[PDB]
Amino acid sequence: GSRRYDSRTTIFSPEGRLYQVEYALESISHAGTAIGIMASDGIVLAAERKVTSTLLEQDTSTEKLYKLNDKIAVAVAGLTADAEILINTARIHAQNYLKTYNEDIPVEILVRRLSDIKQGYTQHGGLRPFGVSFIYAGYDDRYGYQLYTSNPSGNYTGWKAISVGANTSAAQTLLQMDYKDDMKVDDAIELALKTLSKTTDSSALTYDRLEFATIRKGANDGEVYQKIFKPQEIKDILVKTGIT
Amino acid sequence: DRGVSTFSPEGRLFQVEYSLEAIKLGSTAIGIATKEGVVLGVEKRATSPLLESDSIEKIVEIDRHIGCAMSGLTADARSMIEHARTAAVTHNLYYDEDINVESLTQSVCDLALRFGELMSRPFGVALLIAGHDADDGYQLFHAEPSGTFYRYNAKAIGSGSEGAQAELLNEWHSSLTLKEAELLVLKILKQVMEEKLDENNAQLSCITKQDGFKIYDNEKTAELIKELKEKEAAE
Amino acid sequence: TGYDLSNSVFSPDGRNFQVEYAVKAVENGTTSIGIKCNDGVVFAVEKLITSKLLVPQKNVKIQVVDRHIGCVYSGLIPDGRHLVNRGREEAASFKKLYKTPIPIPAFADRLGQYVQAHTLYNSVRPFGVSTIFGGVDKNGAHLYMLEPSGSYWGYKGAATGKGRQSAKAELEKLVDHHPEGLSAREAVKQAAKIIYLAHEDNKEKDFELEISWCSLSETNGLHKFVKGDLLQEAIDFAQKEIN
Amino acid sequence: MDIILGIRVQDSVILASSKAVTRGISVLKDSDDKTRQLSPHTLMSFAGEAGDTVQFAEYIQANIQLYSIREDYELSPQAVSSFVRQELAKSIRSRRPYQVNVLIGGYDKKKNKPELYQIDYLGTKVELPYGAHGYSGFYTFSLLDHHYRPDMTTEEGLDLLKLCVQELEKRMPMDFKGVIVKIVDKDGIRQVDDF
Amino acid sequence: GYDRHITIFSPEGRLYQVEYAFKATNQTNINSLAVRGKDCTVVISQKKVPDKLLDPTTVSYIFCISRTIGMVVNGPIPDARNAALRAKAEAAEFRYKYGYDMPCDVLAKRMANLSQIYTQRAYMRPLGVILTFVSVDEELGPSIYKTDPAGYYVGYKATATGPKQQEITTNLENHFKKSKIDHINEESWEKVVEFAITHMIDALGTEFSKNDLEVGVATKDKFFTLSAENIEERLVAIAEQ
Amino acid sequence: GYDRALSIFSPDGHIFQVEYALEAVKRGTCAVGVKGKNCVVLGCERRSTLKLQDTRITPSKVSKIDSHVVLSFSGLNADSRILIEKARVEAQSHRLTLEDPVTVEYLTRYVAGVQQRYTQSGGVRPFGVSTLIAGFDPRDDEPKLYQTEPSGIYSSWSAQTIGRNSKTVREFLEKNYDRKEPPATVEECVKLTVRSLLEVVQTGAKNIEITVVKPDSDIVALSSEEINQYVTQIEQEKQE
Amino acid sequence: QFNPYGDNGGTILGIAGEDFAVLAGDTRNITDYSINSRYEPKVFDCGDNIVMSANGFAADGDALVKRFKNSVKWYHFDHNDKKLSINSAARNIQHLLYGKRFFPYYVHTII
Amino acid sequence: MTDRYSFSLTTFSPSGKLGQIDYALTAVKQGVTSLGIKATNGVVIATEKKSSSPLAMSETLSKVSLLTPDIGAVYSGMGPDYRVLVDKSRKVAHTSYKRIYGEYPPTKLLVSEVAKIMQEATQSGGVRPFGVSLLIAGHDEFNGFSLYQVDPSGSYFPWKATAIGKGSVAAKTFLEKRWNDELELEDAIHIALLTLKESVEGEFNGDTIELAIIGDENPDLLGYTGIPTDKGPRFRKLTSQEINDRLEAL
Amino acid sequence: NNYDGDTVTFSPTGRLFQVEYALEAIKQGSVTVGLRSNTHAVLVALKRNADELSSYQKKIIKCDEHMGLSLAGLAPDARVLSNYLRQQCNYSSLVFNRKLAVERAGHLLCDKAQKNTQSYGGRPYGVGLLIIGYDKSGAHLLEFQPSGNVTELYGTAIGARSQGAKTYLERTLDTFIKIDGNPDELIKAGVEAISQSLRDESLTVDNLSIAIVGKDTPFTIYDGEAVAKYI
Ligand SMILES: [Cl-]
């Protein structure tokens, strides 16, 4: 019957690893590097678009940085199509929570929900896992600014600064070297772009090969503003920090 | 790979034959039926001294007139016990009476072959179901994962089974007393066990018409162990 | 290779080897035949007497569908029974909705589509039977033969099983020597002969002859088993021709 | 059940709820506590059809307690009330709706404010300084309209509540066997044993 | 090498089960041809009754799908009948739901979409058949639309299918290169059938008796198959000029 | 639905998927449980490969199932969340129907039952998780400590460890833990738990988490500095 | 409107002796003012020395008696030909009757 | 029966490759060249009508398809997969958008919906990915003119201009030199015809080329008058004659 | 070989190996004998024990007052099939007030066993059954195989060493068929038949199992000291 052709996506190796999760992570290691850096007064999301063309319409393009609600955003690493399935689920969960409790969803609860979905695809159903790793940047009134990451296993962890995708070993060393706890958003912006500039497999880091975003309490009084940077604004911040 | 319910060329179900190998690895359990009662005894086999051995529950009550001992993958037995308890209670609800030991055993054994591609594999545990009813008196059954159950005068299952069964072969007769059976289970357990038999790493139980199914206290079993040692030293 | 391990898999030829292996089971079975006559059809089958302990006339192989259709098959007997059970359901629902009994060509496609359905998936096995069937409807007599692939045609004479070549040769002579046609009572006698001649391929064990027929004149268009004197008359005729 | 009142003062919420439980002809109990603690600083009183009331209250209680454990965090009174309202709004279009009216008195530890929410069986939520369900409002609201002030102390709130209960005991035909009063403040929930 | 057993992509970007279903198509060893007249669409197909025991009247690869649509099949008869029954059901449902007779090209698309599903979904195998649908459509006029196991379909001026399709195709190609029109300029369907048979004879290089052919004709508001005597009359006219 | 029998018997009588789930537990960070006379302490390893972590928001290794019971684990982190959720739900369902919180034994038996069900259900793999469940039964001052594992077997322990290098810390506990006189105070029990982790952990900085559970729903997690004081005192006594 | 119930009349009587028991019933079956039958047996031997009668709506009575007799048969199969005691029969009948709690057997049963 | 293939047929290999998606892209590579160019006041999509036989009527086979009145699509790869995708795309444009908001979806969202269908075939049980790459050109009020590519994986990218299939590498290089941000629609059509000539071997005319535009509103093609706000479809398929006219000025 | 992984797969010679392996399980099973006259039908079964402490596995199952069978092979599968027969017998009685014909009972067993041989996932039944009964056309004896093949016979035997008993019956055919209105002599012929299949072991009191049905005889099983008469 059909058994003959079954890959068996949800099984342990003899070593106690989930084959497909490991291979999905290998897939993600080739994706464009995404970096998150959390500061005391905001969060930075910086990400590298993969070998773009001159004919790509950059201003209407979105492959890396997506908005989940007004307070939470995500940086994607891996299959964009897989990520969008999960992003629409997360967007719904946030609105379900808002409808039920009349309060914006706390960041961790959203992250857990998405991470639980990914876990399900590794334990049951016989389907391949989502080949996606997220960096979640978000704010709530309980924990303030938060950075998380999730991967195809469905395991998630919290971070002060973190990279996903390509060259994370190199990237995480550079972040670990220059990061400090009292750091500010404008400093974190500079660190994010400097790290990408050194870890990039491209010859030079330019505005057209980047997506960039900041979650700031730099909004008029006690409230939070998400800023997805436009191509011209990414070009300006590259000149400001002194990379181009 | 291959079907779960596949027949071998010899005419046996592969999975059922493999589950029997799991049961051979399990800890020893011995049952002895007499006209004064049935005795059930088990090797606890704690994997470390820090494990509180009184938490090892390999002897279990199904109803007041039916007890049960297990050997093999003991986690698999929990749903079997649950079904057995439910079957025993449900029959009492429908018929205002105790359920026959055989009928209970049959109800448990009907689960065994409900596997395919229902559950995904046979049970990896054998059961010694011991009880009493008015029609057939004191009874001991051996319920396998094949769905087959044999009634026994005495039976050993687990890692020391064929050695213990040969010993039960010689020792059993139709005029055994309950006290004689208790000592005989303890004797044979001590023989096949790796570690030295005491009240903490071995458990006794019995089922009598008057008092029903009872698990023995460690203090009570300790006395029967001391009584055994003396009677073996006596010749 | 591996194209013969799963049903519904095209080999590089364009063939479904599992169906062709089902044919081998059919070829292993006993001989069964069909003869189309003037106003009806005659079915006959070889029943191997495995032992003296078999009760004569009891293990009936030919089956009736509705009241006007006869079915006989060679190969895996249970598979044939399963197909007839379906045929009876098809014929019942037809008559339920449309009032009239199912026409034979209509009935033939109901079996055909069902057997063909068992060559579409790997989760089922093809039928291990060639079925010869037919009867009398409003448009007259019809004889069909249905293979494991779902392939079926109308026939003047039909034969399947281990003695099919022997039988087919005999059927071809009848078609040549009777262009104007064959009568129902003639066809019963000839059916008996052909089974007796086809028994040379299964000559180790002795056998029991079983015959049935539908005929507009002889049975009012209804399926009936050939019994008693008419059966013995056909056996005598058959025994005379082999000697 | 019959009479449930609620009043939000300066620094606490006070809920008064009758003790009588009547089954048609006889008063089966005169000491029934028509309330459940949903979280340490959130109390829900309730009244409506038999069985439904307690089943609903305990179901809400369990869900909030489940949330409290999962997140290691107490939901705000507003959040709990919104959850409760949704459950009732879902209920009203069911095969058999919950016939239960509730008051949710809670102290928001973040804002340092007492909060009273009145929700009926339809899922009709309103935040109020003082509230009631059933016929209770008809007698008491005229007194509360007059005497209520937003800066009242808890002791002043209890005195105003006594005046409301006295008016009910005078003019209501049913003997509701007095009320159990409970206070919800920054320190949690406590019961006024003498009333 | 399980990428050749089920309908999934091979490393080359190929579906081998679809390609092997195309090979099952020629297993009957029958050649079909379809051409269009002014008022009609004619389809002819070789008829081969090898066994004398067969009732030759029941041996047919041409089907009457609806009153207006006819279908000829190149491939094994079980799959042919599978397709035929479905196309009949689809044509009938279409009329019930939408209030007018299913067009030939729409049916061809519907059957092609079904065949596409068997190329994508693994549990369903492709049918080893090429379905040539013919009608005189009320909007488009004389119509030939053909479907295969790949789920491909297209309209035709004329077409040919079978082991010797290429010889027939080129023969027809050369005729339409002379005439420089998309059809057979002929009033009666009788002469269009005569054209079809003549150009099959020339292409295949074989002579036909009445029992060697099978003919289907689509006119306005009906499709019908010719009897052996109707074909004989056709063969007589060909021989007499 | 996907019905495929993933957990099946092999010729030698083993269920490899259950055994490979144990290998995932062997990979997981070390967890330890030690019960004193009037307390239970759950120690947990945090691997220091991950720095730049946010320890405020990162999922803690010890989880409250109810106000009186806690659950730590070793193995797949994602898998552990599913067991914890189910356990938490069952804890509230038990309170709702029985009008009494779960016993530690009951809660363990439930989690172990869930783990077992996944070893003979179609279309699912076993949980790559072993748990340590600890706490105090309602209105009871006797400490409770249980262990579960992928196969679905569970049992009670005076002290126990699971995860990577658990063989070493079990060796330590087997010689240092006396049953006749367990750690009489909270201090003594925490000290023995920190000591046992220090055999394996590497650095005694942020790599040790300690959670102390006491009777009557008194659960507290120690801070870095509080644990660091135990680490300091242990090594100063060791220098002799 | 369709009324699924009917009254077939009749009267039954059970008396328990010291070492015996009787279950009597008239043999008249009726609808409204007409006699259907002057001899329609109402009390049945169900095996295992149990007698039964389900008086009232005869269709429901016949259905119940039929089902209990069947219950007796399966009790023998499932439990090694054990005799169904009168007390066990009674409890089994409770579950038969209560099984249709919300569309009852319109009968007064005596065994 | 039952679809017993409830498990994924596309899975991650040790290297992190999704084999079936790569092979689907290989199938797309073998397919006939199609392209898209965005201008300031329009978008053009074009491809070669590769006729399987000269007896076949290539007008009946439409490679360029209307999805909504302001959105059009062209492909490279497996035609049958494209045909069912166009059916599903048209339907989803109604069910998940028009029947809710009372208007047609914007290009990007319809693309998103198509992409979702193609992703699901990449992860769901018992199916292979679609063996096509789409180029979807469209217009909507708030985003203006846009051109998107959609791949077998479900990934989609917006383009100023691009090409897919047989001679895509050469064609993309050709477009990079010619494209600028000040092109008029006629200039884009001219470049499209030049670019497409390089990949075509045989006949190059209006009968062997399919070409459509997303441009100005066509009130002549609306079918009715009387509602000022309804101004007609921006999608228009160029006729065989209209193509040949521009081939003379080539 | 490569075509024995499941029941849904024909071999190149047209064989169903899983069915043949299920057939093999019957040959491993203990011997049982069936035989009939015109008035009575008899089952005689050799019961098998695990060891000397164990009981002897029951081989005979009652299906109705007028029908029952003896088993050989997987006993749980016989339990499933006998339970199905009990129900079908019971449905015939309840709905039609009609005792189920033995021939029709065979047809139902055949069809039930067949569905397991054509579908994926399942397995064939691993048991052979000998059904005896007395219906409106007199005494009957059937032989069920899990291939689906059911066969009406005068006498037969299935199980290990069954060929000896089957040869004896084939010789005795003309004698035992004529044992009308004499149950004890028909049982004697069955006991003498099953004796031809014995090696080493002999018929003891708790080893032998006999059943009988007839004209004025309900299906009744004889075990223990009830069969000591015939030893
Ligand atoms: Cl369609």
Numbering used by the authors:
A (entry chain P): 1 to 244
B (entry chain R): 1 to 117, 125 to 242
C (entry chain T): 2 to 244
D (entry chain X): 1 to 195
E (entry chain U): 2 to 242
F (entry chain Q): 1 to 240
G (entry chain Z): 1 to 111
H (entry chain O): 1 to 250
Task: Reproduce the article's own wording on this structure.
Upon the FDA approval of the boronic acid containing inhibitors Velcade® (2003) and Ninlaro® (2015), proteasome inhibitors are of enormous public interest due to their potential as anticancer therapeutics. Hence, the number of studies on selectively and specifically inhibiting the 20S proteasome core particle (CP) has grown exponentially over the past decade and confirmed that some pathogens modulate this fascinating multi-catalytic machinery by small molecules, which have originated during evolution. Thus, besides peptidyl inhibitors, a distinct class of proteasome ligands has emerged: small molecule β-lactone-γ-lactam natural products and their derivatives. The chymotrypsin-like activity of the CP harbors a spacious S1-site that is particularly shaped by the hydrophobic amino acid Met45 of subunit β5.
Interestingly, similar to SalA, the homoSalA derivative inhibited the chymotrypsin-like activity of the proteasome in the sub-nanomolar range, while it was two orders of magnitude less potent towards the caspase- and trypsin-like activities. Therefore, we elucidated the yCP:homoSalA complex at molecular resolution to investigate its mode of action. Inspection of the experimental 2FO-FC electron density map displayed the natural product derivative covalently bound to the N-terminal threonine (Thr1) of all six catalytic subunits owing to the high concentrations used for crystal soaking. While the active site nucleophile Thr1Oγ opens the β-lactone ring, the positively charged Thr1NH3+-terminus acts as a Brønsted acid generating a C4-hydroxyl group from the hydrolyzed β-lactone. Although reformation of the β-lactone ring might be considered energetically unfavorable, Thr1NH2 is well positioned to catalyze this reaction, which supports the mode of action of homoSalA to act as a slow reversible CP inhibitor, similar to what is observed for SalB. In contrast, the side chain of homoSalA is stabilized by hydrophobic van der Waals interactions with the aromatic side chain of Tyr168 in subunit β5. Moreover, the crystal structure of the ligand complex reveals rotation of the chloro-n-propyl group from extended to gauche conformation, which is required for possible cyclization. However, while the well-defined fluoroethyl side chain requires only a modest change in the dihedral angle to achieve the final conformation of the five-membered ring, the C4-O→C-Cl distance in homoSalA is approximately 4.6 Å on average and, thus distant from the required geometry and position to form a tetrahydropyran ring system via the preferred SN2 trajectory (i.e., a chair-like transition state). In case of homoSalA extensive hydrophobic interactions with the cyclohex-2-enylcarbinol moiety stabilize the ligand in its bound state. In contrast, only few interactions between the inhibitor’s P1-site and the S1 specificity pockets of subunits β1 and β2 are observed, resulting in significantly weaker inhibition of the caspase- and trypsin-like activities.
